[PDB]
Design a protein around this ligand. Structure first.
Ligand code: SF4
Length: 207
DNA sequence: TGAGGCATGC
């Protein structure tokens, strides 16, 4: 995968500019641009989503579309300052399809081989940022760091620690904010509450 | 429109 394209540097601007050159999997070809993380190395909370969506791929920034707006409300309800956040995605290029007779770009879940190929960028970000806690937003991100057998619905809101992760941060898994939109509106407010609770667990981690 | 975890299809 991407490991040869990751330069030996902790400068997020250099990593981001290099990601524009990555050939670690096929996603780079149909996407507009790599969407790297956003934030500074002084962040103590890192949050990892699945992939850039349609709006993210057009803007070049993580979490700018509907799921990111919901994440924004979740952050405010958990009293998490954005000054403490570095936010990124497990996969750096937008994976999508279109209906043959349609124009809208329809997001497709990254394959597990794409997550594995792209994980060197995530490791590079984690070493550069040295977060005290990593929030895994959804199954793709959580499995990226915790193994393909990990079930976010089974262990969300738990403070976890694994050995093979650089810097031994606390890890907190939760559901991706888009799941609240995809699921029934009847469950949406309860689901938002659950997200906010998990985020509160993550913000109260003390190294 | 914007998951999750299991199942089936080739
Ligand atoms: S997705 Fe990750 S690994 Fe695949 S190309 Fe874009 S950057 Fe390289």
């Amino acid at each position: 995968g991407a490991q040869d394209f990751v330069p030996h540097t902790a400068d997020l601007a250099e990593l981001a500019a290099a990601a524009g050159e990555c050939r670690g999997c096929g996603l780079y070809r149909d996407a507009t641009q790599a969407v790297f993380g956003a934030g500074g190395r002084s962040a103590r909370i890192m949050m990892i989503g699945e992939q850039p969506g349609d709006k993210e791929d057009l803007a070049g920034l993580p979490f700018v579309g509907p799921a990111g707006r919901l994440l924004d409300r979740a952050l405010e309800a958990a009293d998490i300052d954005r000054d403490a956040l570095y936010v990124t995605n497990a996969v750096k290029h937008f994976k999508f399809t279109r209906a043959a007779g349609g124009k809208r770009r329809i997001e497709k879940t990254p394959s597990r081989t794409e997550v594995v190929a792209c994980r060197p960028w995530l490791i590079a970000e984690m070493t550069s940022v040295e977060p005290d806690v990593v929030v895994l937003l959804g199954a793709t991100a959580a499995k990226a760091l915790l193994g393909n057998d990990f079930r976010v619905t089974q262990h969300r809101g738990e403070v976890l620690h694994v050995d093979d992760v650089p810097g031994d941060p606390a890890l907190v898994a939760t559901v991706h904010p888009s799941s609240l939109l995809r699921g029934p509106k009847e469950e949406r407010e309860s689901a938002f509450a659950g997200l906010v609770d998990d985020l509160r667990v993550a913000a109260d981690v003390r190294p």
